[PDB]
Amino acid sequence: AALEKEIAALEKEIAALEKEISKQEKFYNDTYNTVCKELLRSRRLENSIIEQKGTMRVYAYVMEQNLPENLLFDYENGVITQSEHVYKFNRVIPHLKVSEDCFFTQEYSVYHDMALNQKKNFNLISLSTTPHGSLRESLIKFLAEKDTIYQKQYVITLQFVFLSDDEFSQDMLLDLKFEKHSISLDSKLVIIENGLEDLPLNFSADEMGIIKVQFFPRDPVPVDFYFIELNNLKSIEQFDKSISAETPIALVLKKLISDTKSFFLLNLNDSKNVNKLLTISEEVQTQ
């Protein structure tokens, strides 16, 4: 039984290699976790710097699968270069290295925790030229899944509506008054306890939309979060609006930009309409 003896010798070598792998995994996991923690240490400093300077938050989220070679991305310095034009950002985020779930935990959570802890009403304004719902999907998972820290100390509520020009406008959950310094809505009010399960099947679909999220502290005044999406070229064109009109779309935009903490995100996807997104990000910071 020479072949059976060789199997024993090969099984012994597999056992020795697998033991080495198991040990290696422990070290790898420690280093991997440290990297994630250290990156967040940087983001906390970055956030503290933004607060000191009082500048507006404008971030870029880059999918470089089908984009022109002319457009160059500096993920370390927050710069997009065309042509000698340089577009400045707080951070330029690579989609290849950072997923939608990772965006919220690594790149967004510092901002989120800050605004929520100092009871400041805040928002996330996401701009894109291609409709994609995996970002909105990740937001809900991050905020209102069963086991999140936000579900632990807050009761979480959601309202999802879509405003169109002009003028209506419908509820996105089925089938507005401006009080003090927050936007109240007369729509369907849904309490989330288990994440996307409490929302309809058409919620994360299609991979101006407004999501209003309220945070009621457990043991009186609810903290408001607003999630704005512009899906395509036409939607972002209305966002420009001579820095012209009084459409309900612009009426809530002006309210949030002046009365709440803003977070601007540019989702660069298609190669056809990159330049228009880049121009408006420059227009947001200067105005």
Partner 1 sequence: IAALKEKIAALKEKIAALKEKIKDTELGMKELNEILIKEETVRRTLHNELQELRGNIRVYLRIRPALKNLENSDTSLINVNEFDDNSGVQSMEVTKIQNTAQVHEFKFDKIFDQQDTNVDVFKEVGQLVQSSLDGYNVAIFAYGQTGSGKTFTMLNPGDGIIPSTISHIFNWINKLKTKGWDYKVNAEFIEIYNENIVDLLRSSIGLKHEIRHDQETKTTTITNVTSVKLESEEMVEIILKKANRTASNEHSSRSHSIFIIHLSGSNAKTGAHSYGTLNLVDLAGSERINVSQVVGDRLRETQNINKSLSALGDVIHALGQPDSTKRHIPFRNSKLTYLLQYSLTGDSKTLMFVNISPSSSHINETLNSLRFASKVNST
- If binding is defined by CB under 8 A, does position 7 make contact with partner 1? yes
Q: Which residue's CB is nearer to partner 1, number 49 or number 72? A: 49
Strand boundaries in 109-181, DSSP class E: 122-128, 154-162, 170-171, 177-179
Choices 2-10, 166-174, 182-190, 268-276; region in contact with partner 1 by CB under 8 A:
2-10
Residue 155's DSSP bridge partners are 216
Residue 215's DSSP bridge partners are 156, 223
- If binding is defined by CB under 8 A, does position 97 make contact with partner 1? no
- If binding is defined by CB under 8 A, does position 74 make contact with partner 1? no
Q: Which residue's CB is nearer to partner 1, number 39 or number 205? A: 39
- If binding is defined by CB under 8 A, does position 14 make contact with partner 1? yes
Contact 236/230 with Cβ under 8 angstroms?
yes
Instruction: Give the CA distances from residue 208 to residues 23, 58, 253, in Å, rounded to whole numbers and listed in that order.
Output: 51, 19, 10
Residue 28's DSSP bridge partners are none
How many residues contact partner 1, by CB under 8 A? 31
Report which DSSP code applies to 66. Answer: S
Q: Which residue's CB is nearer to partner 1, number 97 or number 218? A: 97
CA distance 63 to 67: 8
Which residue, among 126, 128, 81, has the nearest Cα to 104 in the 3D structure? 126
Secondary structure of residue 54 in the 3-state scheme? coil
Choices 26-34, 153-161, 214-222, 252-260; region in contact with partner 1 by CB under 8 A:
26-34
- If binding is defined by CB under 8 A, does position 193 make contact with partner 1? no
CA distance 175 to 231: 22
- If binding is defined by CB under 8 A, does position 94 make contact with partner 1? no
- If binding is defined by CB under 8 A, does position 28 make contact with partner 1? yes
Degrees to nearest 5, angle at CA 77 with 88 and 136: 70
Q: Which residue's CB is nearer to partner 1, number 77 or number 184? A: 77
For residue 78, the tally of other CB atoms under 10 A from its CB is 18
- If binding is defined by CB under 8 A, does position 3 make contact with partner 1? yes
- If binding is defined by CB under 8 A, does position 283 make contact with partner 1? no
Q: Which of residues 104-163 bind partner 1 (CB under 8 A)?
A: 118
CA distance 286 to 36: 33
Q: Which of residues 32-51 bind partner 1 (CB under 8 A)?
A: 32, 34-35, 38-39, 41-42, 45-46, 48-49
CA distance 139 to 146: 14
Q: Could you tell me the smallest distance in angstroms from the CB atom of residue 157 to partner 1?
A: 28
Token pair, residue 286, equals 């200067």
- If binding is defined by CB under 8 A, does position 20 make contact with partner 1? yes
Q: Which residue's CB is nearer to partner 1, number 6 or number 166? A: 6
Q: Which residue's CB is nearer to partner 1, number 31 or number 99? A: 31
Which residue, among 125, 94, 136, has the nearest Cα to 235 in the 3D structure? 125
- If binding is defined by CB under 8 A, does position 207 make contact with partner 1? no
Residue ranges binding partner 1 (CB under 8 A) = 3-4, 6-7, 10-11, 13-14, 17-18, 20-21, 24-25, 27-28, 31-32, 34-35, 38-39, 41-42, 45-46, 48-49, 52-53, 118
